Design goal:
This is part of a larger assembly, with 3 copies of chain A, 1 copy of chain C and 1 copy of chain D. By secondary structure, chain A is mostly helical. Helix content of chain A is about 70%, strand content about 0%. In chain A, helix 4 runs antiparallel to helix 5. The chains are: A mainly alpha, C mainly beta, D alpha/beta.
Chain lengths: ~130, ~70, ~80, ~290, ~60
C-alpha cells in the first residue's frame, strides 16, 4: 500500500547498509579460499572428502546470500531492483553466484577419480596380494 | 589503481603502507572479477611487472642509502 | 541529450531530476561524483519519447511522486 | 684451528633452510644466506669457526661468491652440492649447472693466484691419492680437485615417488650410478640425507676440515658413499641388474615423469580482442 | 673490523643487478581450487620488501656471532 510504503526509506537504508556490510563480508570470507579456510581443516576432522567440504562451503555461502536476497526484497518490496539500489545488489549477487557454480570441480575431480578408477577402485583382484 | 601505482614511490620505506596499498589495489581487482571483464589476469600480469619495477627501484634506492 | 527541463528533487538533498530533448528522464546524484545520471528513464512507449518541458515532484514526504509531461501529450507518475 | 669455510649450493627449497635447521632461520629469499658453524673441536668446542654460505638461484651471484671465496679461503673450502629427491632430474643436470658455475669461479677468481695452480694441483694429486686408502687404481676423474662433496636431500620420499612413478629398480639404480659416478669423477663423495635422518654429515666435515665412520650402500633407501669406496665395476653391476645398460637418453625418463608431467595452472590463452571500424565496414561488405 | 667492513661491502654488493633487481620475486602458490580472486597480485611480491629489508639485517646478525 503506497500510503503505508512511503514513510520508511530511512529505516530501509539502515537495513540496506546492514545487508551491504554482510554481503561484503561474504565477498571477503569467500575471497579467502576453501583450501586455506580453517573450516576445511575442521570439516576434515569431521571426516569429509575435501571435494565435498569445499562444495559444502560454497553451497552454504550461496544459501546465506540467497537468504540475504530474500531479506532484501522483503524489505524493499517486490519492486526491488527497480529501486535505485536493488539493481546494483542484484548484479553483484548474480556475479557472486556465478563465481560459485562448482559443478566444474565435480567434473574435473570426477575425471581424476575416473582416471584412478581405471585400475584402483576395485582392487580385490588379488585378495591377498603378493608383496 | 593508478593513484596507488603512481604513489608507490611516495611512502618511503614502510612495508605496512606498501601492504596497505597492494590490498586496496586488489580489492579493486575483485571488483573487476565479479563483473568479469575480458582478460583480467593478463592485465594483472602487466601491472605486477611494472609494480615489481617500481618496487625493486624503491628498494635499490633505499638499499644504497641503508 | 539536451536537457529541456530540470529542477531539484523533493526531500532528496543529494538528487537532481531532469527532462531531456529525447524524452528520457534522467536522475543525477551529487555525492557519487558521476557526471552522468545514474537512473535514466527508458525510451519505451510507456515512457516519454518526446521532450519533457515540465517534469516535477508533487507533494510532501509521503504525498510525492514525479510527474513527467512531455510534449507528446502523456503524463507519467 | 683457524677460520674454516663452507660453500653449500642451496637449490630451490630442497630442505636447505631445513638442512641447517636440522643441523641447528630468518627467511630464504635473498641467497648467500650465511651461517657460521662453531661446533665441537673433537674434545670440547674450540669454536670450530666453520663459516657456511648458501646461494640459491642464478642471477649474477658471482660477486657474492667473491664475498664468500677469497684467495686464502681456498684450503678450507668444503663445497657441498645439495639437491632434492622430489625432483631428481633437476639434480642430474643442475648439479653440472652449479658445477660449471664454480668451474668459471675457478678460472675467474683463482686465475690471479697462480701459486695454487702449480701447487694445489700437485696437492690435489697428493690429496686424491688419499681419497681412497684406509676406507672400508684409476677412474676417469675430473679437473676439479680441492675438498669437494656432493650431498643429496629429500630422500625420505622414496615410497612417495614409487607411489607416483618410480616402482622400478632401474629408476633407483640408474640415479645412484650417475650420482656415485659424478662424485668419483669430481674428486668428491656422494651423501644422502632426509627429513629427520642421517647425522653422517659432520662426521666427514669435522673429519676433513680438521670421528671416522663405516660406509653404507646397503639399505639402498638411503645411501652413504665416502670417498674411495668406489670403482667403475660395482656400479656397473648395479646399472646392469635389468637397468637398461648405460642409457644416454633416460635422463629424459626421470626428466619426463614429473618434469614433463603437465602444467595445471597455466593461462596461455590469448582469449579475445576485437575492433570497431573494421567490424563496421566488414558488415558493410556483408550488407550486399 | 676489516671483516666487518667486508660484511658492509657485502651489503654494498647488493647493487649486483645494477638498480633493477630483475628477479626480485620469491613464492608460488598451489594449483587451481575454487576462487573468485582469479588474479591476485603476486605470492612472490608482497612479502619481498620486508624479506629484503630483514635479510639485510640478518646477515649482519650472523656475522656478529
Amino acid at each position: 500500500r503506497p500510503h503505508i510504503r512511503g514513510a520508511i526509506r530511512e529505516y530501509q537504508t539502515q537495513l540496506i547498509q546492514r545487508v551491504k556490510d554482510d554481503i561484503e563480508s561474504l565477498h571477503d570470507k569467500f575471497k579467502v579460499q576453501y583450501p586455506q579456510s580453517q573450516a576445511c581443516k575442521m570439516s576434515h576432522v569431521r571426516d569429509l572428502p575435501p571435494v565435498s567440504g569445499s562444495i559444502i562451503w560454497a553451497k552454504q555461502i550461496d544459501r546465506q546470500l540467497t537468504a540475504y536476497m530474500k531479506r532484501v526484497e522483503d524489505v524493499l518490496g517486490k519492486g526491488w531492483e527497480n529501486h535505485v539500489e536493488g539493481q546494483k545488489l542484484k548484479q553483484d549477487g548474480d556475479s557472486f553466484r556465478m563465481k560459485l557454480n562448482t559443478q566444474e570441480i565435480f567434473d574435473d575431480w570426477a575425471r581424476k577419480v575416473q582416471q584412478r578408477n581405471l585400475g584402483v577402485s576395485g582392487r580385490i583382484f588379488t585378495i591377498e596380494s603378493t608383496r | 589503481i593508478d593513484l596507488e601505482v603512481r604513489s608507490l614511490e611516495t611512502c618511503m620505506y614502510d612495508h605496512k603502507t606498501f601492504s596497505e596499498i597492494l590490498n586496496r589495489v586488489q580489492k579493486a581487482v575483485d571488483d573487476l572479477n565479479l563483473h568479469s571483464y575480458s582478460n583480467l589476469p593478463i592485465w594483472v600480469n602487466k601491472l605486477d611487472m611494472e609494480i615489481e619495477r617500481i618496487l625493486g627501484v624503491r628498494l635499490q634506492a633505499g638499499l644504497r642509502a641503508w | 541529450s539536451a536537457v529541456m527541463s530540470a529542477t531539484f528533487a523533493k526531500f532528496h538533498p543529494n538528487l537532481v531530476v531532469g527532462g531531456t530533448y529525447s524524452g528520457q528522464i534522467v536522475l543525477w546524484d551529487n555525492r557519487s561524483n558521476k557526471r552522468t545520471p545514474v537512473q535514466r528513464t527508458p525510451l519505451s512507449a510507456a515512457a516519454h519519447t518526446h521532450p519533457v518541458y515540465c517534469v516535477n515532484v508533487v507533494g510532501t514526504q509521503n504525498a510525492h511522486n514525479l510527474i513527467s509531461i512531455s510534449t507528446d501529450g502523456k503524463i507519467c507518475s | 684451528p683457524s677460520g674454516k669455510n663452507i660453500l653449500v649450493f642451496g637449490e630451490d627449497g630442497s630442505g636447505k633452510t631445513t638442512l641447517m635447521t636440522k643441523l641447528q632461520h630468518g627467511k630464504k629469499g635473498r641467497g648467500l644466506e650465511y651461517l657460521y658453524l662453531s661446533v665441537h673441536d673433537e674434545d670440547r668446542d674450540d669454536h670450530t669457526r666453520c663459516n657456511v654460505w648458501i646461494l640459491d638461484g642464478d642471477l649474477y651471484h658471482k660477486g657474492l661468491l667473491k664475498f664468500a671465496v677469497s684467495a686464502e679461503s681456498l684450503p678450507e673450502t668444503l663445497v657441498i652440492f645439495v639437491a632434492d629427491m622430489s625432483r631428481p632430474w633437476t639434480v642430474m643436470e643442475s648439479l653440472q649447472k652449479w658445477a660449471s658455475v664454480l668451474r668459471e669461479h675457478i678460472d675467474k677468481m683463482k686465475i690471479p693466484p697462480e701459486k695454487m695452480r702449480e701447487l694445489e694441483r700437485k696437492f690435489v694429486k697428493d690429496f686424491q691419492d688419499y681419497m681412497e686408502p684406509e676406507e672400508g687404481d684409476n677412474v676417469l676423474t675430473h679437473n676439479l680437485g680441492i675438498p669437494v662433496l656432493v650431498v643429496c636431500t629429500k630422500c625420505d620420499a622414496v615410497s612417495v615417488l614409487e607411489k607416483e612413478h618410480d616402482y622400478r629398480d632401474e629408476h633407483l639404480d640408474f640415479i645412484q650410478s650417475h650420482l656415485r659416478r659424478f662424485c668419483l669423477q669430481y674428486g668428491a663423495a656422494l651423501i644422502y640425507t632426509s627429513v629427520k635422518e642421517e647425522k653422517n654429515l659432520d662426521l666427514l666435515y669435522k673429519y676433513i676440515v680438521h670421528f671416522t665412520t663405516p660406509a653404507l650402500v646397503v639399505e639402498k633407501d638411503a645411501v652413504f658413499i665416502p670417498a674411495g669406496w668406489d670403482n667403475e665395476k660395482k656400479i656397473a653391476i648395479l646399472h646392469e641388474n635389468f637397468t637398461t645398460v648405460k642409457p644416454e637418453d633416460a635422463y629424459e625418463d626421470f626428466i619426463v615423469k614429473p618434469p614433463v608431467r603437465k602444467l595445471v595452472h597455466d593461462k596461455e590463452l590469448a582469449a579475445e580482442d576485437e575492433q570497431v571500424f573494421l567490424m563496421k565496414q566488414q558488415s558493410l561488405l556483408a550488407k550486399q | 673490523x676489516x671483516x666487518x667492513x667486508x660484511x658492509x661491502x657485502x651489503x654494498x654488493x647488493x647493487x649486483x643487478x645494477x638498480x633493477x633487481x630483475x628477479x626480485x620475486x620469491x613464492x608460488x602458490x598451489x594449483x587451481x581450487x575454487x576462487x573468485x580472486x582469479x588474479x591476485x597480485x603476486x605470492x612472490x611480491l608482497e612479502e619481498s620488501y620486508s624479506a629484503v629489508m630483514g635479510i639485510v639485517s640478518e646477515v649482519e646478525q650472523y656475522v656478529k656471532v
